[PDB]
Design a protein around this ligand. Structure first.
Ligand SMILES: [K+]
Ligand SMILES: [K+]
Ligand SMILES: [K+]
Ligand SMILES: [K+]
Ligand SMILES: [K+]
Ligand SMILES: [K+]
Ligand SMILES: [K+]
Ligand SMILES: [K+]
Ligand SMILES: [K+]
Ligand SMILES: [K+]
Ligand SMILES: [K+]
Ligand SMILES: [K+]
Ligand SMILES: [K+]
Ligand SMILES: [K+]
Ligand SMILES: [K+]
Ligand SMILES: [K+]
Ligand SMILES: [K+]
Ligand SMILES: [K+]
Ligand SMILES: [K+]
Ligand SMILES: [K+]
Ligand SMILES: [K+]
Ligand SMILES: [K+]
Ligand SMILES: [K+]
Ligand SMILES: [K+]
Ligand SMILES: [K+]
Ligand SMILES: [K+]
Ligand SMILES: [K+]
Ligand SMILES: [K+]
Ligand SMILES: [K+]
Ligand SMILES: [K+]
Ligand SMILES: [K+]
Ligand SMILES: [K+]
Ligand SMILES: [K+]
Ligand SMILES: [K+]
Ligand SMILES: [Mg+2]
Ligand SMILES: [Mg+2]
Ligand SMILES: [Mg+2]
Ligand SMILES: [Mg+2]
Ligand SMILES: [Mg+2]
Ligand SMILES: [Mg+2]
Ligand SMILES: [Mg+2]
Ligand SMILES: [Mg+2]
Ligand SMILES: [Mg+2]
Ligand SMILES: [Mg+2]
Ligand SMILES: [Mg+2]
Ligand SMILES: [Mg+2]
Ligand SMILES: [Mg+2]
Ligand SMILES: [Mg+2]
Ligand SMILES: [Mg+2]
Ligand SMILES: [Mg+2]
Ligand SMILES: [Mg+2]
Ligand SMILES: [Mg+2]
Ligand SMILES: [Mg+2]
Ligand SMILES: [Mg+2]
Ligand SMILES: [Mg+2]
Ligand SMILES: [Mg+2]
Ligand SMILES: [Mg+2]
Ligand SMILES: [Mg+2]
Ligand SMILES: [Mg+2]
Ligand SMILES: [Mg+2]
Ligand SMILES: [Mg+2]
Ligand SMILES: [Mg+2]
Ligand SMILES: [Mg+2]
Ligand SMILES: [Mg+2]
Ligand SMILES: [Mg+2]
Ligand SMILES: [Mg+2]
Ligand SMILES: [Mg+2]
Ligand SMILES: [Mg+2]
Ligand SMILES: [Mg+2]
Ligand SMILES: [Mg+2]
Ligand SMILES: [Mg+2]
Ligand SMILES: [Mg+2]
Ligand SMILES: [Mg+2]
Ligand SMILES: [Mg+2]
Ligand SMILES: [Mg+2]
Ligand SMILES: [Mg+2]
Ligand SMILES: [Mg+2]
Ligand SMILES: [Mg+2]
Ligand SMILES: [Mg+2]
Lengths: 61, 101
RNA sequence: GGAGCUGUAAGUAAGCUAUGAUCCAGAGAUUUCCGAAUGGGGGAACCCAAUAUCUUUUAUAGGAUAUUACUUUUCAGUGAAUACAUAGCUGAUUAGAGGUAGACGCAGAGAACUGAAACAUCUUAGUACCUGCAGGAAGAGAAAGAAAAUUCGAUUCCCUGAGUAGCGGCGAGCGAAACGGGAAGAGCCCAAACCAACAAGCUUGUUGGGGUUGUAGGACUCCGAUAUGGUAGUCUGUUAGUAUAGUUGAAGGAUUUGGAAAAUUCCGCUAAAGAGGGUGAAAGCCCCGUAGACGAAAUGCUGACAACACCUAGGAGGAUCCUGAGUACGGCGGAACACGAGAAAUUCCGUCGGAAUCCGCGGGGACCAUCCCGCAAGGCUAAAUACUCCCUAGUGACCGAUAGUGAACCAGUACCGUGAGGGAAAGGUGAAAAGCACCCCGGAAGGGGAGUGAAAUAGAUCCUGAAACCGUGUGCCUACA
RNA sequence: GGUAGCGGAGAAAUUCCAAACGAACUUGGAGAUAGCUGGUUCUCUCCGAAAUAGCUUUAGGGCUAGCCUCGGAAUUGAGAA
RNA sequence: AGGUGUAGUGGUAGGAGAGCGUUCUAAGGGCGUUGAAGGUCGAUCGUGAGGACGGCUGGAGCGCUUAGAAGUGAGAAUGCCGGUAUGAGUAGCGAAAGACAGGUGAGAAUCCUGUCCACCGUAUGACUAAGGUUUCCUGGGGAAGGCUCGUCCGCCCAGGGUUAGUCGGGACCUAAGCCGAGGCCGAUAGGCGUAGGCGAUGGACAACAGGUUGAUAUUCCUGUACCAGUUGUUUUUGUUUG
RNA sequence: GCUUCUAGUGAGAAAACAACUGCCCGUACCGUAAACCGACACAGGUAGUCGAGGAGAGUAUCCUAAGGUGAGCGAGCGAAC
RNA sequence: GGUGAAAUUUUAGUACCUGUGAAGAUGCAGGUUACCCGCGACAGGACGGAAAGACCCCAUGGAGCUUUACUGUAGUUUGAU
């Protein structure tokens, strides 16, 4: 799935609201990036949210 | 059933009330029994049964087992049956007199 | 369990059974092929292989059994670009893969008709539908709570609060919560400091100890006891009970009517049993039962008891150390809160920014101060609650075959449809077949006799047998209206 | 053999998509909604209308009033001719 | 309790009141094989819904009183289901040639046989794929089905029938397309796709003629072949410069 | 499939003759139809092969061959329409 | 001779004229005509049958279509991050 490998962030549904407050369904997606991380000793390209990378505790080898 | 093949029974209800006979066959699933000389029927048989005239055959038809009371062999009277253990053999006892079977 | 049995279903046939059959209950054995299917393939119930062992034939062909899907977990072995490696690859190991009960639970995603007497906010609804994950229940749960009578002391559910406070094109509508009363009740484990061991590049991981919180707790430093209590542990036995077959179980004869008695009349009797069913009509005393007493080889289930395992320290000190960060929180955009952005607290999602840390932090419905109450960013937890495809025993001022399940009957059948799917009609002879031998007309069908039966105008299209409709007989009337 | 309904396909006709296609079929929401039309089952007794006003996205709908009915209270009798 | 007097008593929508009848419940009190309910008939009673009483039928149940609860009353919904009418003995009996003799039989325009006649003949003949799925053959049958009839039938009953190394398919091949280890993508579900496969309508591939049965035949049989392979016999040549 | 080429694989090969082995599925019947699709023993629809003679260009046409068929209501009458 | 439907149908012993009447009557009024039952024919009437008019209007019905109607929105594009 298109899911943040570390924090679990994923696509969800939200509402568009117009000025008249009309409601239509929209998707709301996380800021996922393909990043090479050292998962269990091996580099691999996994989806990672920019939020999980913000701290610098996630490898960027 | 409380009555068994070979038993001597007395008819307590029916057209043949007070007749007595031996049980020729018992039908436990039907709760019925055949008694000699009781509930005879006249059957109109086609001769396809090895009887080269057909004829009207007299046979005993079954009667309900509750229309029959077992005869006390030692007493000749009809009696209700109790189950008392004798010699470790569970047997039928004449409620009226205490005789077995 | 104790005399018959070989199902519905007769019939013939051939058999079984007191050396205990059929039947009943517990436990096992067998269990073809398809189907997740899984050696490969495939238009399900078929086809075609590999490897090993065995077997058939002189031999080839033939047959049998076993193993061989995929991914996951761990281990081993091989092993690329590429040096060491890693990936890949082979084997082993380990675990999932589908179905349901058309119910109940949680979560993702999410309508519309509809209401608003139109309609975009709103409503219908977070409903229907779809999808994931479940569990016997789920979810919630051990206060960064409810409060301000001064206090309460986890959660859940019921009553009430209350159609109140509120929300709302302030329309239509939506609609709490706390207190109070009940059901049921239960609490616990981690992370960190610190200590010890090991391994590695003075820290930096693994293991074990330690520790668990708000009248702040713990580490730490002092002393002092190795007790006392508890449990939401285990196919640990033992024991009892219990479920799944059963045994036993009172007391009526005549008379009248009738085909038949249980009806009737006459006298009796039994009752810890006068619930109910059956029996040739309506039976406490004929049968099955009922009240009551009694019963378990086997396998479950439950409760104890024992065993074993697992938890469980008091008090005084604060110098220092610890107490969950990309977290809390904020901006922006959505959502959830009864609460529609609103003056909008509280909770959550996306995005960006982004704290303090006990002299701290959060909440008390914008916000600030004060006071009070709590201590988030870690997890677990029985009961009270929801539901019933099934199983056992019952109940009904529920139905009685156009009803009651669609289906009382060989019904999800026949039948319709390419398919998804739609979906019927159809119960009753008689007490017993005693289901009309034989005769007569007829090719038969069908009748007429003769019989059976209480009755056949009960003859199988069989209880009763309405009406429409069709016919036969004829008392009266009818061919100038 | 492929394309499927918020669609496909169309030398283009709103043409075809299993004998009715301006949008298939089936099941479900679902007993959609219907200010409309139709239907609504025994009896007798007492009384007995209206088809008007006002307002209405109202005009064959509705609401209050008027007119009917039932019960009740009460007054110096307030009604009618 | 009733009596007198006066007055009143048409009625849709609709209001009020009081009752009839249906099934069930409770209690009481009863009736039933000396015949319950139901059905049917009758010249019966009450102000109404309706209520009795007899005869016949029927064969087991059912009233009455008081109170209770209701799936409680049908003639209309182009209502639903069933039955049966009307139109009617009417329309229709589905594109065409038959005739007679003899037979069979209870019965024949309609079945069998014969004769002549007529019709199709790039067919109305002969094969075969699909589809159907027992309809094939033999012996019986005449309820239903057959648009009439029926002794007959693609119907019913009872038996039987499909034989291959060479035909067509598989153990061969691939096309379109489909599936798809890992893989890529995506709220879920899943979508796509590599290796690898599946998949003919195409490629490849060894026998024919005749005979035979009521029903099968390039399948059985006869004759004569072919393809792949197996065992053995003889003959040649090669044993690791093979 | 087949034919070649070496790489590899090899102790045995080949010929003649004799004897012998060769699995599964379909294989009835209808099939311009009364037995298929059309609710029907329905004047429709149903791919491919063979499809003769005279006259003829011909598979047209007419009549015929091999072969198949007389077709599932009839008998009269010989009006209107 | 055999076999045998259907639409329709409130019950029907189902005439004519003039009139009447929801304004076009087999059925009402007045008068007139007409013995009873059929068969073959024809269609003037039964405002004949068939279809809950399609034209017309209406329902704060529906659907498809259009646009500089309203409100949204896929897509496209521009900036910030
Ligand atoms: K499978
Ligand atoms: K269920
Ligand atoms: K809406
Ligand atoms: K409305
Ligand atoms: K839980
Ligand atoms: K309320
Ligand atoms: K409104
Ligand atoms: K501890
Ligand atoms: K009896
Ligand atoms: K009894
Ligand atoms: K036990
Ligand atoms: K808010
Ligand atoms: K608070
Ligand atoms: K608090
Ligand atoms: K009878
Ligand atoms: K008559
Ligand atoms: K076209
Ligand atoms: K009033
Ligand atoms: K009567
Ligand atoms: K009706
Ligand atoms: K009819
Ligand atoms: K008729
Ligand atoms: K025959
Ligand atoms: K073959
Ligand atoms: K082929
Ligand atoms: K064959
Ligand atoms: K010629
Ligand atoms: K020709
Ligand atoms: K014929
Ligand atoms: K004529
Ligand atoms: K004419
Ligand atoms: K009129
Ligand atoms: K006419
Ligand atoms: K339309
Ligand atoms: Mg398999
Ligand atoms: Mg509305
Ligand atoms: Mg007893
Ligand atoms: Mg008695
Ligand atoms: Mg809200
Ligand atoms: Mg806050
Ligand atoms: Mg935020
Ligand atoms: Mg406090
Ligand atoms: Mg619980
Ligand atoms: Mg039913
Ligand atoms: Mg009935
Ligand atoms: Mg039904
Ligand atoms: Mg009778
Ligand atoms: Mg009858
Ligand atoms: Mg006259
Ligand atoms: Mg006269
Ligand atoms: Mg047009
Ligand atoms: Mg069409
Ligand atoms: Mg709804
Ligand atoms: Mg009046
Ligand atoms: Mg009057
Ligand atoms: Mg009754
Ligand atoms: Mg009713
Ligand atoms: Mg009716
Ligand atoms: Mg006619
Ligand atoms: Mg014909
Ligand atoms: Mg000709
Ligand atoms: Mg021609
Ligand atoms: Mg035949
Ligand atoms: Mg035959
Ligand atoms: Mg016939
Ligand atoms: Mg082949
Ligand atoms: Mg794919
Ligand atoms: Mg995969
Ligand atoms: Mg490929
Ligand atoms: Mg070949
Ligand atoms: Mg043949
Ligand atoms: Mg053949
Ligand atoms: Mg045809
Ligand atoms: Mg007039
Ligand atoms: Mg007139
Ligand atoms: Mg008249
Ligand atoms: Mg008059
Ligand atoms: Mg008309
Ligand atoms: Mg209309």
């Amino acid at each position: 799935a298109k899911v943040c490998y570390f924090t679990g962030r994923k696509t969800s549904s939200g509402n568009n609201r117009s000025h008249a407050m009309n409601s239509t369904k929209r998707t709301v997606k996380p800021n996922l990036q393909k990043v090479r991380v050292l998962i269990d000793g091996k580099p691999k390209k996994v989806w990672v949210s920019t939020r999980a990378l913000k701290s610098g505790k996630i490898e960027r080898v | 059933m409380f009555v068994k093949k070979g038993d001597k029974v007395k008819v307590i209800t029916g057209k043949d009330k007070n007749k007595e006979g031996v049980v020729l066959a018992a039908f436990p699933k039907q709760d019925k029994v055949i008694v000699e000389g009781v509930n005879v029927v006249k059957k109109h048989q086609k001769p396809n049964q090895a009887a080269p005239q057909g004829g009207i055959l007299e046979v005993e038809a079954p009667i309900h087992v509750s229309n029959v009371m077992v005869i006390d062999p030692s007493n000749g009277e009809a009696t209700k049956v109790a189950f008392k253990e004798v010699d470790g053999k569970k047997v039928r006892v004449s409620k009226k007199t205490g005789e077995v079977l």
